[PDB]
Amino acid sequence: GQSITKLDSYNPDTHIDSNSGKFLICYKCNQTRLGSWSHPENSRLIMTCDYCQTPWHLDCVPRASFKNLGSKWKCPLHSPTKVYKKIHNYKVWKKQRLINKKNQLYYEPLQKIGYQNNGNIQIIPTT
Amino acid sequence: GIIQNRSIFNLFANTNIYIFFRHWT
């Protein structure tokens, strides 16, 4: 009955956060469809993002699998590391890879407005 | 605000009567 696919049985211990005990509220529908075990068809499958742990229903983002193996599943809210834009050929941009702290320099612009950053930025708190 | 010949009846309960009623349902 218990499969990694989480499709062969009604498993309500997936809408409940393990380390907090609260309900995993899906981001788009703002609900958790836990079901009732008397109407298990009313339960909507929910997964969490593998990066920011944002819980998403399987229907709010169109997905049929749970992404059990392979690459880590990315929720739609994350900024892309690779995009293609039309020249109107094309141009590509890839985000810089992460660098260890001994060889990575974080610098703060002096120019606030219109500073052409390569798209590789860091957000600082606003004071 | 008197509700004569009432039809909606309310049962207030703790977890025990609620779980008993849930098993009945």
């Binding site: - | 009432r6 909606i8 703790n14 025990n16 009567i17």
Partner: protein, 93 residues
Amino acid sequence: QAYNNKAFKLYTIDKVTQSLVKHAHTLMTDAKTAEIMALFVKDRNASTTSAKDQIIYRLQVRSHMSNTENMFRIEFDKRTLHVSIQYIALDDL
């Protein structure tokens, strides 16, 4: 074989009836539990009640048990036998 596997939910009828029986047994034989059902008896038997009776019945039920317990409003409607259950755990406090 009779229901073409559509009666699979009846496989544990003995266990669920046993659990219902056990829940009834601890329902009468628990302190701060049987007087709630007695208050339900007084509310159901004595009809033609206004709203103020319903709130004082609510706090009288609340005063029987602990301040951290959960309340449930199991509404019944004679017409249609429709039991609406509402979660007011630590809401009327």
